Design an enzyme around this catalytic site. Structure first.
Site, mmCIF file in Angstrom:
data_model
loop_
_atom_site.group_PDB
_atom_site.id
_atom_site.type_symbol
_atom_site.label_atom_id
_atom_site.label_comp_id
_atom_site.label_asym_id
_atom_site.label_seq_id
_atom_site.Cartn_x
_atom_site.Cartn_y
_atom_site.Cartn_z
ATOM 1 N N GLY B 40 -15.957 83.194 4.547
ATOM 2 C CA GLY B 40 -14.959 84.002 4.951
ATOM 3 C C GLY B 40 -14.974 85.118 3.772
ATOM 4 O O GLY B 40 -15.435 85.029 2.826
ATOM 5 N N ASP B 156 4.085 84.257 6.994
ATOM 6 C CA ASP B 156 2.819 84.934 7.385
ATOM 7 C C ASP B 156 2.506 84.109 8.694
ATOM 8 O O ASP B 156 1.173 83.869 8.624
ATOM 9 C CB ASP B 156 1.952 85.235 6.497
ATOM 10 C CG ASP B 156 0.935 86.197 6.959
ATOM 11 O OD1 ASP B 156 0.020 86.297 6.085
ATOM 12 O OD2 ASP B 156 1.374 86.948 7.820
ATOM 13 N N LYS B 158 0.998 82.898 11.711
ATOM 14 C CA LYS B 158 0.210 83.445 13.107
ATOM 15 C C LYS B 158 -1.200 82.547 13.102
ATOM 16 O O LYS B 158 -1.298 81.467 11.965
ATOM 17 C CB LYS B 158 -0.359 84.757 12.631
ATOM 18 C CG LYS B 158 -0.912 84.757 11.393
ATOM 19 C CD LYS B 158 -1.235 86.296 10.835
ATOM 20 C CE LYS B 158 -2.000 86.580 9.738
ATOM 21 N NZ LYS B 158 -2.124 88.024 9.299
ATOM 22 N N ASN B 161 -3.710 81.926 10.190
ATOM 23 C CA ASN B 161 -3.381 81.180 9.112
ATOM 24 C C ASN B 161 -3.112 79.557 9.287
ATOM 25 O O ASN B 161 -2.526 78.983 8.444
ATOM 26 C CB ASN B 161 -2.226 81.827 8.346
ATOM 27 C CG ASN B 161 -2.363 83.036 7.715
ATOM 28 O OD1 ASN B 161 -3.647 83.314 7.437
ATOM 29 N ND2 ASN B 161 -1.259 84.090 7.421
ATOM 30 N N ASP B 174 -2.631 80.652 3.381
ATOM 31 C CA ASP B 174 -2.194 81.982 3.077
ATOM 32 C C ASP B 174 -0.788 81.926 2.778
ATOM 33 O O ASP B 174 0.005 82.187 3.351
ATOM 34 C CB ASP B 174 -2.825 82.960 3.970
ATOM 35 C CG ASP B 174 -2.957 84.191 3.455
ATOM 36 O OD1 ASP B 174 -1.962 84.536 2.269
ATOM 37 O OD2 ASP B 174 -3.504 85.175 3.776
ATOM 38 N N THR B 191 2.948 90.413 9.726
ATOM 39 C CA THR B 191 1.839 90.806 10.688
ATOM 40 C C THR B 191 2.918 91.587 12.047
ATOM 41 O O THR B 191 3.608 90.690 12.278
ATOM 42 C CB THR B 191 1.018 89.962 11.227
ATOM 43 O OG1 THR B 191 0.292 89.092 9.971
ATOM 44 C CG2 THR B 191 -0.122 90.260 12.092
HETATM 45 N N1 ADP Z 1 -9.180 75.276 2.878
HETATM 46 C C1 ADP Z 1 -10.106 76.188 3.590
HETATM 47 N N2 ADP Z 1 -10.971 75.428 4.582
HETATM 48 C C2 ADP Z 1 -11.836 76.231 5.221
HETATM 49 N N3 ADP Z 1 -11.614 77.511 5.122
HETATM 50 C C3 ADP Z 1 -10.871 78.166 4.411
HETATM 51 C C4 ADP Z 1 -9.965 77.479 3.827
HETATM 52 N N4 ADP Z 1 -9.220 78.409 2.994
HETATM 53 C C5 ADP Z 1 -9.486 79.657 3.305
HETATM 54 N N5 ADP Z 1 -10.588 79.516 4.213
HETATM 55 C C6 ADP Z 1 -11.293 80.558 5.016
HETATM 56 O O1 ADP Z 1 -10.926 81.842 4.643
HETATM 57 C C7 ADP Z 1 -10.061 82.656 5.278
HETATM 58 C C8 ADP Z 1 -9.082 83.415 4.531
HETATM 59 O O2 ADP Z 1 -8.172 82.465 3.941
HETATM 60 P P1 ADP Z 1 -6.450 82.793 3.636
HETATM 61 O O3 ADP Z 1 -6.118 81.456 3.349
HETATM 62 O O4 ADP Z 1 -6.254 83.665 4.819
HETATM 63 O O5 ADP Z 1 -6.708 83.525 2.164
HETATM 64 P P2 ADP Z 1 -6.564 85.140 1.718
HETATM 65 O O6 ADP Z 1 -6.522 85.881 3.215
HETATM 66 O O7 ADP Z 1 -5.780 85.146 0.890
HETATM 67 O O8 ADP Z 1 -8.167 85.468 0.975
HETATM 68 C C9 ADP Z 1 -9.501 81.703 6.269
HETATM 69 O O9 ADP Z 1 -9.307 82.226 7.624
HETATM 70 C C10 ADP Z 1 -10.751 80.651 6.375
HETATM 71 O O10 ADP Z 1 -11.847 81.353 7.282
HETATM 72 MG MG MG Z 2 -4.686 86.957 0.083
HETATM 73 MG MG MG Z 3 -5.486 85.704 4.556
#
Ligand code: ADP
Ligand code: MG
Ligand code: MG
Lengths: 18, 340
Positions: B40, B156, B158, B161, B174, B191
Site C-alpha cells: 500500500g 480517525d 473509519k 483504518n 493509523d 475525515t
Molecule cells: N499492519 C498492517 N498489515 C497489513 N497492511 C497494513 C498494515 N499497516 C498498514 N497497512 C497497509 O497500509 C495502508 C495504510 O496504513 P495506515 O495505518 O493507514 O498508515 P499511513 O496512512 O499513516 O501510512 C493500510 O490501509 C493497509 O493497506
Molecule cells: Mg500517516
Molecule cells: Mg492512513
C-alpha cells in the site's frame, strides 16, 4: 433512493483525512 | 466483574506509562528483512510486506522518508505516533514489532494483518447485518475504553483504518491523529464523514468525538453508506451540525435508539460522555447479546473470515509497481528524529 444519492456524491471510494 | 475491569485498566495504565516514559528505539535493522511486495501507499513512503530472515515471519513495514516528513511539517505527529504504538498493548490495536531508522528513512515494522482494511470488504459485500456490525462495534467499544483510560483520543475512526486479521477480528491502525488529552484539544483533523459537530464548529473538544465517530461507523456498517454525505465536504458539515439524521427502514428500533444517542449533537446528552461513561453504550439494548469478555478473548466466532492461503498471502491487497528502496550515503534530518 438514499443509496443512489450516495453513488451520486462521488465519495464512495477511500476517504482522505483533513 | 466491574472490579475486574478497574484492576485490568489500572495495570494497563502502569504498563503504558512505563513504555511511554522510556520508549524503545532501534530494535532491528533493514538488512534483517527481505522485501516481498508493496502492500500500500503510506503517508511518506511505501508499506511493504517483508520477511524476517532469521525467523521467516512476515511483517508489514512502513517506510517514512525523513525529508518528506520535515517538508510536510509532520515531525511531531510522526514521533508521537511511534511513541504511542510502542507503548500500547490491546488485542484490537496493531502491534509494533520493531522500529529503527537509517540515513534516509524511518521504519515501523508491524504484525502483518492479512485481511486488509474493512472498507474494501464493506463496499464489496454492500452492508453488514446487524449481528455482523455489532461484532465489529463491540471491538471498537472496548478499544476506546482502553485508549480513553490512557487519556488517548484516537480521532480517525473509519472503515479505512480497521484491518481484519486471519481470525476475522479488528486491528485498529493509523495513529497519526491520536493525542494524549486529559481535557480539551482544538486541532481540526479527521475525515469529513466522521467529524463530530464540535470539531466542525471549531470548539474545544474531548474524547466524546470518538463516540460520535463510533455512531457514524455503526451506521455505515449497517447501512452500507454513511449517515452524512454530499458532493463536497462543506455540504457534509452542514448536515452533521443540523441535528437531523435519517435511518434505513431495515434498522432495528434498538439500533436506531443507540445511534440517536451516539449521533447526538448535544454533548451533554451523548452516550460515552455522561456520568456512567462507556457503560451507557455497553449496557444498551442493542448490545444485550454481546459477551464483552468473550469478544476481548477473541472467542466469538467471527461472521467473516478473509481469504488467506498461508503466510505471505497478499490476495486482499492491491498491486503496486515495485521500486528499489534507496538509502542515501548521507544522513538526513538526524536532529529532528533523535527520539525515534
Ligand atoms: N499492519 C498492517 N498489515 C497489513 N497492511 C497494513 C498494515 N499497516 C498498514 N497497512 C497497509 O497500509 C495502508 C495504510 O496504513 P495506515 O495505518 O493507514 O498508515 P499511513 O496512512 O499513516 O501510512 C493500510 O490501509 C493497509 O493497506
Ligand atoms: Mg500517516
Ligand atoms: Mg492512513
Amino acid at each position: 433512493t438514499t443509496y443512489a444519492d450516495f453513488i451520486a456524491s462521488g465519495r464512495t471510494g477511500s476517504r482522505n483525512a483533513i | 466483574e466491574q472490579e475486574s475491569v478497574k484492576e485490568f485498566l489500572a495495570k494497563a495504565k502502569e504498563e503504558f506509562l512505563k513504555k511511554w516514559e522510556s520508549p524503545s528505539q532501534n530494535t532491528a535493522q533493514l538488512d534483517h528483512f527481505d522485501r516481498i511486495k508493496t502492500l500500500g501507499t503510506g503517508s511518506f513512503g511505501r508499506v511493504m510486506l517483508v520477511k524476517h530472515k532469521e525467523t521467516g515471519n512476515h511483517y508489514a513495514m512502513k517506510i517514512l522518508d525523513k525529508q518528506k516528513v520535515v517538508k510536510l511539517k509532520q515531525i511531531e505527529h510522526t514521533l508521537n505516533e511511534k511513541r504511542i504504538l510502542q507503548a500500547v498493548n490491546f488485542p484490537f490495536l496493531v502491534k509494533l514489532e520493531f522500529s529503527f531508522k537509517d540515513n534516509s528513512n524511518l521504519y515501523m515494522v508491524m504484525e502483518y494483518v492479512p485481511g486488509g482494511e474493512m472498507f474494501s470488504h464493506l463496499r464489496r459485500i454492500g452492508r453488514f447485518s446487524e449481528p455482523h456490525a455489532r461484532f465489529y462495534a463491540a471491538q471498537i467499544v472496548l478499544t476506546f475504553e482502553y485508549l480513553h483510560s490512557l487519556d488517548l483520543i484516537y480521532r480517525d475512526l473509519k472503515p479505512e483504518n480497521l484491518l481484519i486479521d486471519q481470525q476475522g477480528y479488528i486491528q485498529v491502525t493509523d495513529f497519526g491523529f491520536a493525542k494524549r488529552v486529559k481535557g480539551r484539544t482544538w486541532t481540526l483533523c479527521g475525515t469529513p464523514e466522521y467529524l463530530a459537530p464540535e470539531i466542525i464548529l471549531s470548539k474545544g473538544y474531548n474524547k466524546a468525538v470518538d463516540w460520535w465517530a463510533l455512531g457514524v461507523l455503526i451506521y455505515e456498517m449497517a447501512a452500507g453508506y454513511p449517515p452524512f454525505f454530499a458532493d463536497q465536504p462543506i455540504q457534509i458539515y452542514e448536515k452533521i451540525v443540523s441535528g437531523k439524521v435519517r435511518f434505513p427502514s431495515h434498522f432495528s428500533s434498538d439500533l436506531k435508539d443507540l445511534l440517536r444517542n451516539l449521533l447526538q449533537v448535544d454533548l451533554t446528552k451523548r452516550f460515552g460522555n455522561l456520568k456512567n461513561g462507556v457503560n451507557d453504550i455497553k449496557n444498551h439494548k442493542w448490545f444485550a447479546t454481546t459477551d464483552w469478555i468473550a469478544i476481548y478473548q477473541r472467542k466469538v466466532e467471527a461472521p467473516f473470515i478473509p481469504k488467506f492461503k498461508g503466510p505471505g498471502d497478499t490476495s486482499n491487497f492491491d498491486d503496486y509497481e515495485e521500486e528499489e528502496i534507496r538509502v542515501s550515503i548521507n544522513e538526513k534530518c538526524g536532529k529532528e528524529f533523535t527520539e525515534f
